[PDB]
Enzyme design. Structure first.
Site, PDB file in Angstrom:
ATOM      1  N   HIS A   1       1.991   3.863  -1.120  1.00  0.00           N
ATOM      2  CA  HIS A   1       0.823   3.817  -0.208  1.00  0.00           C
ATOM      3  C   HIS A   1      -0.410   4.430  -0.879  1.00  0.00           C
ATOM      4  O   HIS A   1      -0.935   5.461  -0.403  1.00  0.00           O
ATOM      5  CB  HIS A   1       1.161   4.446   1.126  1.00  0.00           C
ATOM      6  CG  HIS A   1       2.101   3.615   1.922  1.00  0.00           C
ATOM      7  ND1 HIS A   1       3.432   3.926   2.034  1.00  0.00           N
ATOM      8  CD2 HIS A   1       1.914   2.483   2.643  1.00  0.00           C
ATOM      9  CE1 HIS A   1       4.030   3.024   2.799  1.00  0.00           C
ATOM     10  NE2 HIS A   1       3.117   2.115   3.189  1.00  0.00           N
TER      11      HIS A   1
ATOM     12  N   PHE B   1      15.684  -6.626   4.379  1.00  0.00           N
ATOM     13  CA  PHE B   1      14.230  -6.626   4.668  1.00  0.00           C
ATOM     14  C   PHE B   1      13.718  -8.070   4.737  1.00  0.00           C
ATOM     15  O   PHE B   1      12.999  -8.467   5.713  1.00  0.00           O
ATOM     16  CB  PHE B   1      13.504  -5.807   3.603  1.00  0.00           C
ATOM     17  CG  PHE B   1      12.024  -5.638   3.819  1.00  0.00           C
ATOM     18  CD1 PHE B   1      11.532  -5.262   5.068  1.00  0.00           C
ATOM     19  CD2 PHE B   1      11.136  -5.827   2.772  1.00  0.00           C
ATOM     20  CE1 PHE B   1      10.177  -5.086   5.264  1.00  0.00           C
ATOM     21  CE2 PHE B   1       9.788  -5.617   2.961  1.00  0.00           C
ATOM     22  CZ  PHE B   1       9.311  -5.252   4.210  1.00  0.00           C
TER      23      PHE B   1
ATOM     24  N   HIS C   1      -6.701   0.243   5.301  1.00  0.00           N
ATOM     25  CA  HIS C   1      -5.596   0.136   6.292  1.00  0.00           C
ATOM     26  C   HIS C   1      -4.548   1.213   6.063  1.00  0.00           C
ATOM     27  O   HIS C   1      -3.742   1.435   6.994  1.00  0.00           O
ATOM     28  CB  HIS C   1      -4.968  -1.265   6.300  1.00  0.00           C
ATOM     29  CG  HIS C   1      -3.866  -1.442   5.315  1.00  0.00           C
ATOM     30  ND1 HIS C   1      -4.094  -1.699   3.995  1.00  0.00           N
ATOM     31  CD2 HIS C   1      -2.533  -1.379   5.464  1.00  0.00           C
ATOM     32  CE1 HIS C   1      -2.939  -1.826   3.369  1.00  0.00           C
ATOM     33  NE2 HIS C   1      -1.963  -1.628   4.241  1.00  0.00           N
ATOM     34  N   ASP C   2      -4.523   1.829   4.887  1.00  0.00           N
ATOM     35  CA  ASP C   2      -3.553   2.905   4.531  1.00  0.00           C
ATOM     36  C   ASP C   2      -4.290   4.118   3.923  1.00  0.00           C
ATOM     37  O   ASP C   2      -3.639   4.923   3.284  1.00  0.00           O
ATOM     38  CB  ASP C   2      -2.486   2.345   3.570  1.00  0.00           C
ATOM     39  CG  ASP C   2      -1.299   1.643   4.248  1.00  0.00           C
ATOM     40  OD1 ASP C   2      -1.033   1.887   5.469  1.00  0.00           O
ATOM     41  OD2 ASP C   2      -0.623   0.841   3.563  1.00  0.00           O
TER      42      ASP C   2
ATOM     43  N   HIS D   1      -1.836  -0.519  -3.730  1.00  0.00           N
ATOM     44  CA  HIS D   1      -1.355  -1.229  -2.517  1.00  0.00           C
ATOM     45  C   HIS D   1      -2.545  -1.731  -1.703  1.00  0.00           C
ATOM     46  O   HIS D   1      -2.543  -2.906  -1.344  1.00  0.00           O
ATOM     47  CB  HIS D   1      -0.407  -0.365  -1.680  1.00  0.00           C
ATOM     48  CG  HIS D   1      -0.107  -0.930  -0.330  1.00  0.00           C
ATOM     49  ND1 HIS D   1       0.624  -2.069  -0.134  1.00  0.00           N
ATOM     50  CD2 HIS D   1      -0.444  -0.480   0.904  1.00  0.00           C
ATOM     51  CE1 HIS D   1       0.695  -2.312   1.165  1.00  0.00           C
ATOM     52  NE2 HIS D   1       0.045  -1.348   1.818  1.00  0.00           N
TER      53      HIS D   1
HETATM   54  C1  LIG Z   1       9.051  -3.732  -1.331  1.00  0.00           C
HETATM   55  O1  LIG Z   1       9.789  -3.309  -0.181  1.00  0.00           O
HETATM   56  C2  LIG Z   1       9.113  -2.881   0.925  1.00  0.00           C
HETATM   57  C3  LIG Z   1       7.737  -2.919   1.065  1.00  0.00           C
HETATM   58  C4  LIG Z   1       7.131  -2.447   2.217  1.00  0.00           C
HETATM   59  C5  LIG Z   1       7.885  -1.949   3.278  1.00  0.00           C
HETATM   60  C6  LIG Z   1       7.169  -1.492   4.474  1.00  0.00           C
HETATM   61  N1  LIG Z   1       5.882  -1.625   4.548  1.00  0.00           N
HETATM   62  N2  LIG Z   1       5.459  -0.570   5.334  1.00  0.00           N
HETATM   63  C7  LIG Z   1       6.436  -0.295   6.262  1.00  0.00           C
HETATM   64  O2  LIG Z   1       6.279   0.280   7.330  1.00  0.00           O
HETATM   65  C8  LIG Z   1       7.749  -0.825   5.710  1.00  0.00           C
HETATM   66  C9  LIG Z   1       8.423  -1.783   6.707  1.00  0.00           C
HETATM   67  C10 LIG Z   1       8.687   0.340   5.399  1.00  0.00           C
HETATM   68  C11 LIG Z   1       9.282  -1.909   3.161  1.00  0.00           C
HETATM   69  C12 LIG Z   1       9.910  -2.363   1.978  1.00  0.00           C
HETATM   70  O3  LIG Z   1      11.274  -2.321   1.758  1.00  0.00           O
HETATM   71  C13 LIG Z   1      12.215  -1.835   2.768  1.00  0.00           C
HETATM   72  C14 LIG Z   1      13.637  -2.108   2.323  1.00  0.00           C
HETATM   73  C15 LIG Z   1      13.958  -0.999   1.322  1.00  0.00           C
HETATM   74  C16 LIG Z   1      13.137   0.152   1.744  1.00  0.00           C
HETATM   75  C17 LIG Z   1      12.192  -0.327   2.848  1.00  0.00           C
HETATM   76 MG   LIG Z   2       0.390   1.217   6.844  1.00  0.00          MG
HETATM   77 ZN   LIG Z   3       0.101  -1.059   3.941  1.00  0.00          ZN
END
Ligand SMILES: COc1ccc(C2=NNC(=O)C2(C)C)cc1OC1CCCC1
Ligand SMILES: [Mg+2]
Ligand SMILES: [Zn+2]
EC number: 3.1.4.53
Length: 330
Positions: A79, A291, A119-120, A83
């Protein structure tokens, strides 16, 4: 002289990919001296003629972009400014989709891109739930509700009050009220707790989809226009698995670094370790497949229907990346 350094030339050659899915955003971060958000936002504002349309002094734009980039934490693995830059550039490519040609006003385009950039901002690299469970000041300020997303908005807007940072100084009150509402609606919709309702409404919109002559999407009320912008920035936010595998794997390394660091902070404090945050008990590959299957593919499949068949290569890449991660489950 008034010519660029050679590093600035290699950067400008990389920024020629700015209209393409699969931009070398990590290389742009290296070449810009960790200024990917500033250079990519600048490139996009020039390309869409947003400086002229909104009478944004270029010096004010650069000062605000650098101030905003500086309020992303360099020590957070996912974050961060990279990103932010990625979601900005991805939103930019989604806005240019043939099925949305001439649909959205300049103000809406500005809202979507500005939203993406803030946004972050000031993300501390832990979840809303972690901030709530630790009694953090942020959780207290925002009554445990969309804690990070409220904060990102408040910081993004507050930085406009810094010296030479008001990029909306020449907008009318009407333009500013409208831009503000749209940016708040977009960023609040990045909270994953809103994902299921957003996706339900996008599905409803695909089922009742009307097109104009020449086959572009008809959106004749605020509620429908904003829901598409919300889902667009949400798709940009969840677009890592839809990128060339070399990019996706870098995002996976980074989100897993951030998650394991949260898990370490939870284990240290004797808190329950959050899902997929335990480095001693983690299936990276199975987590990515889960995911994609439960969150990313349903969202992008519904997006792809809305803008058929503009998103077919993005969906094909997602399905290829999914089979690659599945084939590495030991
Ligand atoms: C590149 O894998 C990801 C990229 C982003 C995210 C997210 N974005 N922000 C959020 O709130 C979440 C849903 C956690 C989640 C990702 O993998 C998930 C599967 C392994 C860890 C989390
Ligand atoms: Mg966010
Ligand atoms: Zn984001």
């Amino acid at each position: 002289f008034g010519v660029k350094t050679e590093q600035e030339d290699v950067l400008a050659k990389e920024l020629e990919d700015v209209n393409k899915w699969g931009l070398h955003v990590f290389r742009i971060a290296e070449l810009s001296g960790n200024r990917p958000l500033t250079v990519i936002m600048h490139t996009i504002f020039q390309e869409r003629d947003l400086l002229k349309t909104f009478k944004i002094p270029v010096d004010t734009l650069i000062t605000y972009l650098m101030t905003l980039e500086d309020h992303y934490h360099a020590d957070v693995a996912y974050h961060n400014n990279i990103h932010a830059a990625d979601v900005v550039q991805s939103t930019h490519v989604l806005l240019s989709t043939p099925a949305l040609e001439a649909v959205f006003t300049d103000l809406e385009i500005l809202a979507a891109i500005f939203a993406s950039a803030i946004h972050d901002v000031d993300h501390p690299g832990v979840s809303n739930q972690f901030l709530i469970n630790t009694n953090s000041e942020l959780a207290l300020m925002y009554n445990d509700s969309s804690v990070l997303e409220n904060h990102h908005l408040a910081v993004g807007f507050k930085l406009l009050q810094e010296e030479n940072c008001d990029i909306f100084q020449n907008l009318t009150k009407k333009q500013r009220q409208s831009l503000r509402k749209m940016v708040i609606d977009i960023v609040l919709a990045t909270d994953m707790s809103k994902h299921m309702n957003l996706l339900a409404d996008l599905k409803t919109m695909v089922e009742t989809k009307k097109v104009t002559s020449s086959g572009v999407l008809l959106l004749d009320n605020y509620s429908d226009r904003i829901q598409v912008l919300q889902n667009m920035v949400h798709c940009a936010d969840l677009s890592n698995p839809t990128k060339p595998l070399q990019l996706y794997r870098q995002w996976t390394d980074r989100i897993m670094e951030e998650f394991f660091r949260q898990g370490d902070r939870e284990r240290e404090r004797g808190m329950e370790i959050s899902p997929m945050c335990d480095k001693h008990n983690a299936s990276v590959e199975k987590s990515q497949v889960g995911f994609i299957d439960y969150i990313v593919h349903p969202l992008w499949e519904t997006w792809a229907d809305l803008v058929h068949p503009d998103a077919q290569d993005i969906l094909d890449t997602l399905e290829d990346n999914r089979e690659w991660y599945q084939s590495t489950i030991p």
